[PDB]
Write an enzyme that holds these catalytic residues in place. Structure first.
Site, PDB file in Angstrom:
ATOM      1  N   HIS A 112     -18.397 106.610 -70.768  1.00  0.00           N
ATOM      2  CA  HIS A 112     -18.779 106.943 -69.385  1.00  0.00           C
ATOM      3  C   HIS A 112     -20.305 106.768 -69.126  1.00  0.00           C
ATOM      4  CE1 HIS A 112     -18.789 108.548 -65.429  1.00  0.00           C
ATOM      5  NE2 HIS A 112     -19.021 109.816 -65.702  1.00  0.00           N
ATOM      6  N   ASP A 129     -23.116 110.296 -60.645  1.00  0.00           N
ATOM      7  CA  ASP A 129     -21.950 109.800 -61.344  1.00  0.00           C
ATOM      8  C   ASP A 129     -20.981 109.150 -60.362  1.00  0.00           C
ATOM      9  OD1 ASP A 129     -19.782 109.518 -63.130  1.00  0.00           O
ATOM     10  OD2 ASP A 129     -20.219 111.476 -64.084  1.00  0.00           O
ATOM     11  N   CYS A 178     -18.690 101.529 -64.287  1.00  0.00           N
ATOM     12  CA  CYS A 178     -19.690 102.626 -64.412  1.00  0.00           C
ATOM     13  C   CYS A 178     -21.092 102.090 -64.522  1.00  0.00           C
ATOM     14  CB  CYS A 178     -19.402 103.385 -65.735  1.00  0.00           C
ATOM     15  SG  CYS A 178     -17.954 104.473 -65.664  1.00  0.00           S
TER      16      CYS A 178
END
Length: 219
Positions: A112, A129, A178
């Site tokens: 992540h 995020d 991501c």
């Protein structure tokens, strides 16, 4: 005037060629990028640390009074505390009190990719995020660590009253982009622009970083 440009036909083709040699493409500012690394920019691939590091360094060079550390910054800070990262700032040839922002890409659990933003002017530290669950234990720790970094690095002159925030951003439509979103959030933050991009802007980022690599963007 958008932030991530659309490539011209020659530049986009230079990217296709390099992506097909599926070779060194770059060795500057102590970042070697190979076709191997370059291909992590290919559609639907996980962006590796090296590409992140390239992009951070590009943001540094293209943004006044801005530091943008590589992903290994936060790992050392986390695992070893301030002492494990105590020379990192001085190696940037600047002082924390002369900065507007510090960007810290964060690799949570090997996979992540997220972002930390220390805004010295605004006196905030943000967690950004694109695959966000809301606040959690990891995000709280990030914020806490980045705050300790500011307080330490500044010999305790600043950071103790910074707002620790969770900054909303565009949420990725899939589970692999991501990296690109960290890069998008970094570019936008560095320009003090609202985090109001969309997924079509994120796909153009991939081609853009590839272009910057191939055109030796770090000067």
């Amino acid at each position: 005037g958008s932030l991530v440009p659309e490539l011209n036909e020659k530049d986009d083709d230079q990217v296709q060629k390099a992506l097909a040699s599926r070779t060194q493409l770059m060795n500057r500012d102590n970042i070697e990028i190979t076709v191997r690394d370059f291909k992590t920019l290919a559609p639907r691939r996980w962006l590796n640390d090296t590409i992140i590091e390239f992009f951070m360094k590009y943001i540094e060079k293209s943004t006044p009074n801005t530091v943008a550390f590589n992903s290994f910054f936060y790992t050392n800070l986390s695992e070893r505390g301030y002492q494990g990262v105590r020379r990192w700032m001085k190696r940037k040839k600047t002082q924390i009190d002369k900065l507007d922002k510090i960007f810290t890409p964060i690799n949570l659990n090997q996979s992540h990719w997220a972002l930390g933003i220390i805004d010295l002017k605004k006196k905030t530290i943000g967690y950004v995020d694109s695959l966000s669950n809301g606040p959690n234990a990891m995000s709280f720790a990030i914020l806490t660590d980045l705050q300790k970094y500011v307080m330490e690095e500044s010999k305790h002159t600043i950071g103790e009253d910074f707002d620790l925030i969770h900054l909303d951003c565009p949420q990725q439509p899939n589970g692999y982009d991501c990296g690109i979103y960290v890069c998008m959030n970094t570019l936008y933050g560095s320009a003090d622009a609202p985090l109001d991009f969309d997924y079509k802007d994120a796909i153009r980022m991939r081609r853009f970083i590839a272009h910057l690599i191939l055109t030796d963007a770090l000067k």
